[PDB]
């Protein structure tokens, strides 16, 4: 069954230069087109570029003409995207889908063209009060760049979380919270862990929060 | 460069009614070949695309039948027959019968659900956050509708204003309602300067808008 998994995104400097890779499994990779689409933070989809099974037609956008570059390894069952010159409207979220239709897409790979250093994220416990239902939470306080990974007790606790979208702080860094709400009187019967995962500054954090 | 123009921007819809989006191209989206390449695409939020119609009116494989795909030439409509509470999130159409490869803007579905009152938490800052010299209040509203709420910041009931940011969740897949936190950003020296810290909240769901508050230490 289908899996596409797109990699090689992160941080990089404006007119840096990136390779974006997207292997493929579960279906005959030569027998379809592969797109990139990328979605800029808060807008719709753009269509970037294509490429058929024989890589025979190439289609690029106006925006990318000149400095992206499309490329297919069959054998590998690899679609690549050599993009230089890079510029801060190209930060985004990129996509490769399968196909004309876009039946497949996979996980998505986030691109941020900034001068900006990266900076790991620093985890503060929001601590429950004292009811019917109770609140608590981690605040993961300036960050970059995005994103940042939340789970509670390792995947275990799902029920009751919000993982709230991130704000840019004047600081220039980014700072989100996650809570997760349980039945007031399970306090203190169940044990609480928000795990913290920065990949672009290789910080991995397990915050205990217990009621103050 | 074929354009779509996507009606409409957004959509409220009761659960189990009806709903239509419309999808038209500058021209005619007819290939050589004879088909007509365009495709409806629904993404929830953080999540990549899932399709829905393809060729105008094919429904994809596992796609449920409420679904259904209309339109040839430049006109061209997605139909829900019945709302269900997952169908929140945004919709487009693709066109994919002539390069460049082109979409639409979207369209936001929203559910009309009955008034919920949000749920109101306040925690005080960690005390390892302090030692750092800066001091974070954050202010929970979960699981409230409509989603026009107004968070009011006081220490020592003094109002504050433009030291304060606001993030709020996309509309939940299941019971339809939307969460909000408020941060209330103070240096550690300024945070120690003040005893009784309060969010109050103004929503549609509460007659007299709500205070939770704590005094720093005690």
């Known amino acids: 069954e289908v899996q596409l998994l797109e990699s090689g995104g992160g941080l990089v400097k404006p007119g840096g230069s990136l390779r974006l890779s997207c292997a493929a499994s579960?279906?005959?990779?030569?027998?379809?087109?592969m797109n990139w689409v990328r979605q800029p933070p808060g807008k719709g989809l753009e269509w970037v570029s294509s490429?058929?099974?024989?890589?025979?037609?190439?289609n690029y956008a106006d925006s990318v003409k000149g400095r992206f570059t499309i490329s297919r390894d069959n054998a590998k069952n690899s679609l690549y995207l050599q993009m230089n010159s890079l510029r801060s409207d190209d930060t985004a979220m990129y996509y490769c889908?399968?196909?004309?239709?876009?039946?497949?897409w996979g996980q998505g790979t986030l691109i941020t063209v900034s001068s900006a250093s990266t900076k790991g994220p620093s985890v503060f416990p929001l601590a429950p009060s004292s009811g019917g239902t109770a609140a608590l939470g981690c605040l993961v306080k300036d960050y970059f760049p995005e994103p940042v990974t939340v789970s509670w007790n390792s995947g275990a606790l799902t029920s009751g979380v919000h993982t709230f979208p991130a704000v840019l702080q004047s600081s220039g860094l980014y700072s989100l919270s996650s809570v997760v709400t349980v039945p007031s009187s399970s306090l203190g019967t169940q044990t609480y862990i928000c795990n913290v995962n920065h990949k672009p500054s290789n910080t991995k954090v397990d915050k205990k929060v217990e009621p103050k | 460069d074929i354009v779509m123009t996507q009606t409409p921007l957004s959509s409220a819809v009761t659960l189990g009614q009806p709903a239509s989006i419309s999808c038209r191209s500058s021209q005619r989206l007819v290939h050589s070949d004879g088909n007509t390449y365009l495709s409806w695409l629904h993404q929830r939020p953080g999540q990549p695309p899932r399709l829905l119609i393809y060729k105008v009116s094919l429904r994809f494989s596992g796609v449920p039948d409420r679904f259904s795909g209309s339109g040839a030439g430049t006109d061209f409509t997605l139909k829900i027959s019945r709302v269900e509470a997952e169908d929140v999130g945004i919709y487009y159409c693709m066109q994919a019968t002539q390069f460049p490869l082109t979409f639409g803007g979207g369209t936001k579905v929203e559910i009309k659900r009955t008034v919920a009152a949000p749920s109101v938490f306040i925690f005080p800052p960690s005390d390892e956050q302090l030692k750092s010299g800066t001091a974070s209040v954050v202010c929970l509203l979960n699981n409230f509708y409509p989603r026009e709420a107004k968070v009011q910041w006081k220490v020592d009931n003094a109002l504050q204003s433009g030291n304060s940011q606001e993030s709020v969740t996309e509309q939940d897949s299941k019971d339809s309602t939307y969460s909000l936190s408020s941060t209330l950003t103070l240096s550690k020296a300024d945070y120690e300067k003040h005893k009784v810290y309060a969010c109050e909240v103004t929503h549609q769901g509460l007659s007299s808008p709500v205070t939770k508050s704590f005094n720093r230490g005690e």
């Open positions: 889908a399968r196909g004309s239709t876009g039946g497949y």
């Open positions: 579960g279906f005959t990779f030569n027998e379809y087109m």
């Open positions: 490429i058929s099974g024989t890589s025979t037609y190439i």
